[PDB]
């Protein structure tokens, strides 16, 4: 495994930018396949979120990062919230792909926001990516 923030960026690359990873990973590759399915099925809800939100800017990407932190503002985390955060970041990446500079700022900051939003200690104390995959196979 590459490191949490790095792995999340890869998830945004594979799921948001639809950039097929060249090598298969036992844990991350199925997770990426699950998040893509979540984007497809819940596209309408993600569109509703960002409907009247002006996020195509560095200021907007900052607020998108704040949006991730708002998920766990009550101090609670589960793999459901973790998936919503990771899928939301991927969806954001997809909408910024045709704007190189904004896309790259998103890739630069949002992986760290998603990781913090989940909670680094909670992530590690619940099995990390193995725990997430197990949750995915059971729910999706």
């Amino acid at each position: 495994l590459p490191g949490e923030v790095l792995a999340i960026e890869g998830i945004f690359m594979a799921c948001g930018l639809n950039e097929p990873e060249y090598l298969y990973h036992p844990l991350l590759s199925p997770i990426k396949l699950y998040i893509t399915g979540l984007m497809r099925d819940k596209e309408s809800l993600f569109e509703a979120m960002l409907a009247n939100v002006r996020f195509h800017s560095t200021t907007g990407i900052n607020q998108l990062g704040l949006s991730m932190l708002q998920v766990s503002g009550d101090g609670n985390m589960n793999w459901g919230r973790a998936l919503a955060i990771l899928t939301f970041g991927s969806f954001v990446a997809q909408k910024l792909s045709n704007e190189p500079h904004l896309r790259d700022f998103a890739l630069a900051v949002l992986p760290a926001y998603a990781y913090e939003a989940i909670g680094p200690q909670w992530f590690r104390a619940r099995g990390g990516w193995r725990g997430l995959k197990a949750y995915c196979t059971q729910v999706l």
Binding site: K42, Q70, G80, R81, L83
Partner: peptide, 25 residues
């Protein structure tokens, strides 16, 4: 003008449905 919390609540609601699937017997 701020819209981060509303998105946070909508992500929470989306997570609720996933957790409902996890808890389904």
């Amino acid at each position: 003008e701020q819209w981060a919390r509303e998105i946070g609540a909508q992500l929470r609601r989306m997570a609720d449905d996933l957790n409902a699937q996890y808890e389904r017997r």
